[model samples]
Target: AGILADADCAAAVKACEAADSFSYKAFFAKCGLSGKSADDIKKAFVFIDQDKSGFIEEDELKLFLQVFKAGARALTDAETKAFLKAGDSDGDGAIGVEEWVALVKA
Candidate 1:
């Protein structure tokens, strides 16, 4: 749907692509599709925010990433922690909607 096909989003996509274990297939699955629309993005967020909490906590996100690669190159505890904060600007110790959107689209 060209949701993240913009120049900025292209850079964002690279960030996700750079992760050795990250997969475009897996990312889209969580994003609620192989396509994108506001509804799709919302479901994607819900999928990651497993507990239905507004923000994604460290444990939740870590677990999600671990399984994202199906354990082939699962991110370590340290890496998962670092990833959560990589684009997290508020230092709130959790991933907000904006942050998740950036990472997912990236």
Candidate 2:
């Protein structure tokens, strides 16, 4: 519950922050949410993951928005689709840090 606060904390958080799911950590950094509370981030990620596997699946993102600030109106199908495709590596069902980082602009 105290994992991520309200800022980026990339200088410290790692891929194992949430249930060993690399996608969450990678996406967190990519999203510029580094140096944040690892536990908070992980908790949020677990909320996102839903399955508790630690990684985000393409089909799980929509439900995740329920906990996020902006709702469905925040993103169009195209943008959401792009985000999903952006992090997918090897066409696998799950995402990884390398693939997630590639999606980041910085």
Candidate 3:
């Protein structure tokens, strides 16, 4: 969210677009969640966004995955739940910055 803070899937996509040498793997790398199995992929985001805001702003989600390997957009409904639980600290179907930061840094 802040300058010089981090990058995410969108950033990776931009990079690939700029270079014209990007591959599917590179696209997923933008999210920084490619390394995670499909099972835990969504959980990984929830873990990053700890506030349970349900919606992660571009930069917010970007910072976490950027540090790792970018995440995949082809998420399934079930996997999404795993991530929501991690982010939804209050079980309100949402997420805040604190939860996001804590989950990401942790």
Candidate 4:
């Protein structure tokens, strides 16, 4: 089961390389996030919010995949936009910490 989880995580990371779009739901499902605690998710959120601006903007969103694994492929513009749309629930063009936690928990 441990090995399988590792494999699924790898697959999730690889799927982000898709040129057309990105699906946070699918990625979370395959990335073993179901086994993660809210604290765990928050830690990742903080790491991804590189600028410490208290929100995730396009620049940080572009490197979203790297939050899961170092050197992972950057998200394409379309993918980044799609991801932003997913977590930016208030339509603020950026994802705040609350939105990010809600996204992961959802």
Candidate 5:
């Protein structure tokens, strides 16, 4: 009730539409909590990674945002690729903890 409010959730859903992907990094950024604790990032990373895999793939990203039911349409091919690339440094097609942490901390 202090900083995070009910309306923020809808704004978050709207932001997801603008970006085409949803990462915990994005969530924290939108919430103005960019300096999220490493433990917090790791915990979220593990859960968001899903499939017990250590990496977050593009399709998995779409699924993550779908939970919001924000009515945001799927990203076009190029937007999806760019979205993944933004967090996936080192040229990898998927996002790893190292990449994820770098973003949330940045």
Candidate 6:
């Protein structure tokens, strides 16, 4: 039902953890997000948004990686906060679809 397969998600997490320095670009590429269409990315965003609020809040954001795979671990507090700050471009304290798309595309 999601864009990434379980193997892809596992590989992405493994690659990210093995890297000396984590990079969102590399993580997304490994997760197959970089190759996906904008609409597909939006669909993925909607999956992660969880509350149907049209915005991704901190609670949902904590489980952002889990949307890619059931076994994926939740993002850590610092990592979650960092992701929030990175995607909350308009400073609304939440990520909208546009911001999610931009983050994935970036």
Q: TM-score per candidate, in order?
A: 0.57, 0.46, 0.36, 0.80, 0.64, 0.81
Error of 4 at 66 (Å): 1.6
Model 3 lDDT per residue over 1-106, tens place: 2211246655754554432243434445455554545546556555545355555643343343233334423233443445556655866565554554444332
Tens digits of lDDT, candidate 4, 33-56:
657777876777777778998888
Error of 6 at 94 (Å): 0.6
Predicted structure 2: lDDT: 0.46
Pairs clashing within candidate 1: 12-106, 13-106
- Global local distance difference test of model 5: 0.61
lDDT of each: 0.57, 0.46, 0.46, 0.75, 0.61, 0.73
Residue lDDT tens for model 5, 35-60? 55778667766766767689988876
Off by over 4 Å in 6: 1-6, 16-23
**How many pairs of residues collide in each model?**
2, 15, 24, 0, 0, 0
In the order shown, what is each candidate's alpha-carbon RMSD? 8.1, 9.7, 10.6, 4.2, 5.2, 3.0
Tens digit of per-residue lDDT, candidate 2, span 1-106: 2233222333223222333233433444544543445554455556656666667776665333334332222233444465677668678756554443344333
Provide the lowest-lDDT 10-residue window in model 3: 65-74
lDDT score of residue 23 within candidate 1: 47
Query: What is the Cα-based lDDT of residue 77 in candidate 5?
Result: 60
TM-score of 3: 0.36
TM-score-best of 4 and 5: 4
